[PDB]
């Protein structure tokens, strides 16, 4: 069944502009296959728990032996939710099938058509789309720029301020204390996506809001559980009654199948391990700082203040060359391009984890040092 022109034309154009132009004829994100022991810095499994014996054992144990809307009775709602709410310090926690669904569902629940959503330019796409599905009025503010935000809120009125605590591509940290004050001053609600700080930051890994003592003045916190928690799920935390309504309003919550009951059990063991992982956190924080200092001195713009390090590689042609150079020299990050970034502001993201070595860190710096001197490409 040949495709009709209206689809074929679109697919043809796409393949030509997104696959064919690259030297390997594949999408820009697709590079060389890695070998042992190349340095792989692509996983969001920050505390390296993917293969943890206890988590795996607990999961299998539980798995041996419909919509979640129908499971909102007290006796149907999972114990992990209460533990996660306690862990973080928020009043209530609601599980979701992914961080994406957590954001989209929360925003569908608290937004009306035309609701003002003040969203950081670099906040996760799931937050942008969540607002758009709700037909909210999106007001993008320049990255971490509170002056710009103040102007927008002054102009458009009360609404929801939406940020990542730690940004997924750049590794920058939101000015959370100032955001809290801005929301108080302007009568806004604050939504913080802690996908990249939950587990890696704060007391026992409770996160950035916890570390800063801001938990009790933030209305909503969300997180993918597919980062430090190493599980395909998400969660919504509320310091209010909103989680009572989400399960019956959010489309992903209504129209998409729920997490199975054994999945919640695996999360309980993961939480316990995370709570105790002080040394892994410490080691990761140290290694990330060593990397940031090492790369910055090379003249690369390194905006990161976290375990996420963004190499700024400009346009797609330049980006292909950079990542080809890195991979050829045993360093494997993740290419972030359109539609995640502007077509001319690509990022090669280095995601550090607690298994990374001092020797590996020095090696990354060495490779990037050579890269800067090579003359085949540039960094921004």
Ligand X SMILES: Cc1ncc(COP(=O)(O)O)c(C=O)c1O
Ligand Y SMILES: Cc1ncc(COP(=O)(O)O)c(CNCC(=O)O)c1O
Residues binding a copy of itself: what is the number (CB under 8 A)? 89
108 in contact with ligand Y (CB under 6 A)? no
Question: Which residue, 182, 152, 145, 179, is CA-closest to 165?
Answer: 179
Asked if 54 interacts with a copy of itself (CB under 8 A), we say no
Peptide bond between residue 37 and the one before it cis (omega within 30 degrees of 0):
yes
Among residues 31, 99, 130, 266, which is the contact residue for ligand X, using CB under 6 A?
Answer: 99
- Select from 23, 35, 37, 64 the one that contacts a copy of itself (CB under 8 A): 64
Should residue 329 be labelled a site residue for a copy of itself when binding is judged by CB under 8 A?
Answer: no
- Per-residue string for binding with a copy of itself, 153-192, x by CB under 8 A? -----xxx--------------------------xxxx--
Measured from the Cβ of residue 355, the count of other Cβ atoms closer than 10 Å reads 18
CB 79 within 8 A of CB 268: yes
Whose Cβ is closer to a copy of itself: residue 294's or residue 360's? Answer: 360
Do the beta carbons of residue 348 and residue 319 sit within 8 Å?
Answer: yes
Q: Can you tell me which of 154, 257, 279, 373 binds ligand Y, judged by CB under 6 A?
A: 257
The token pair at 146 is: 């509170």
Q: How many helices (H) and strands (E) does the chain have?
A: 14, 12
> Of these, 62, 69, 204, 256, which contacts ligand Y (CB under 6 A)?
256
Distance CA 323, CA 358 (A): 22
Which 207-266 residues touch ligand X, going by CB under 6 A?
Answer: 224, 226, 234, 255-257
* Paired tokens of 14: 């796409």
Q: Nearer to a copy of itself by C-beta: 146 or 340?
A: 340
Question: What does the CA dihedral 88, 112, 105, 124 come to, rounded to 10 degrees?
Answer: -80
- How many residues bind ligand X (CB under 6 A)? The answer is 17
Q: Which of 56, 143, 150, 290 binds a copy of itself (CB under 8 A)?
A: 56
Choose the contact partner of 56 out of ligand Y, ligand X, a copy of itself, none; CB within 5 to 8 A by kind. a copy of itself
Among 168, 200, 215, 307, binds ligand X (CB under 6 A): 168
193 binds ligand Y (CB under 6 A): yes
370: Cβ contacts below 8 Å, ≥ 6 apart = 329
CA dist., res. 370 & res. 368, Å (int): 5
Which is nearer to ligand Y, 224 or 243 (by Cβ)?
Answer: 224
Question: Cis bond leading into 339, ω under 30°?
Answer: yes
DSSP bridge pairs for 94: 236
Q: CA 285, CA 200: separation in Å to the nearest integer?
A: 8
Binding to ligand Y by residue 298, rule CB under 6 A? no
Out of 149, 173, 210, 230, the only residue in the binding site for a copy of itself (CB under 8 A) is 230
CB nearer to ligand Y: pick between 68 and 206: 68
How far, in Å, are 55, 310, 348, 349, 368 from residue 333 at the CA level?
26, 9, 6, 5, 12
Q: How far apart are CA 323 and CA 32, in angstroms?
A: 10
Residues within the interface to ligand X (CB under 6 A): 98-100, 103, 124, 126, 164, 168, 193, 195-196, 224, 226, 234, 255-257
Residues within the interface to ligand Y (CB under 6 A): 44, 66-67, 98-100, 103, 124, 126, 164, 168, 193, 195-196, 224, 226, 234, 255-257
């Amino acid at each position: 069944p040949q495709l009709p022109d209206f689809i074929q034309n679109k697919i043809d154009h796409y393949i030509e502009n997104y696959f064919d132009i690259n030297k390997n004829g594949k999408h820009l994100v697709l590079g060389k296959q890695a070998s042992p022991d190349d340095i792989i810095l692509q996983s969001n499994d920050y505390l390296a728990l993917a293969n943890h014996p206890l988590i795996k054992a607990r999961l299998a144990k539980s798995l041996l032996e419909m919509s979640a809307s129908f499971l909102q009775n007290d006796y149907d709602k999972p114990m992990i939710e209460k533990r996660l709410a306690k862990f973080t310090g928020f009043d209530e926690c609601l599980l979701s099938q992914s961080g994406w669904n957590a954001n989209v569902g929360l925003l569908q629940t608290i937004c009306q058509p035309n609701t003002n959503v003040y969203i950081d330019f670099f906040a996760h796409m799931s937050l942008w789309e969540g607002a758009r599905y709700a037909n909210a009025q999106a007001h993008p503010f320049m990255h971490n720029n509170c002056d710009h935000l103040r102007m927008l809120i002054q102009r458009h009125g009360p609404g929801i301020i939406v940020v990542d605590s730690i940004y997924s591509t750049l590794g920058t940290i939101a000015p959370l204390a100032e955001l809290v004050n801005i929301s108080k001053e302007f009568g806004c609600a604050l939504l913080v996506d802690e996908s990249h700080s939950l587990g890696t930051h704060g007391p026992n890994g409770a996160g950035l809001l916890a570390e800063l003592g801001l938990t009790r003045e933030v209305h909503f916190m969300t997180a993918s559980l597919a980062k430090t928690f190493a599980y395909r799920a998400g969660a919504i935390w509320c310091n209010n009654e909103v989680n009572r309504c989400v399960p019956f309003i959010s489309y992903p919550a209504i129209f998409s199948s729920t997490l199975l009951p054994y999945e919640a059990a695996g999360l309980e063991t993961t939480l316990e391990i995370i709570e105790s992982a002080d040394n892994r956190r410490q080691h990761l924080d140290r290694m990330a700082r060593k990397l940031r200092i090492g790369l910055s001195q090379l003249g690369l713009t390194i905006r990161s203040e976290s375990q996420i390090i963004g190499l700024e590689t400009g346009d797609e042609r330049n980006t292909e060359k950079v990542r080809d150079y890195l991979e050829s020299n045993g360093v494997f990050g993740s290419v972030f391009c359109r539609p995640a970034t502007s077509k001319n502001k690509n990022i090669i993201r280095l995601s550090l984890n607690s298994d990374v070595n001092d020797e590996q860190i020095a090696k990354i710096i060495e490779v990037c040092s050579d890269a800067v001197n090579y003359g085949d490409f540039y960094f921004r």
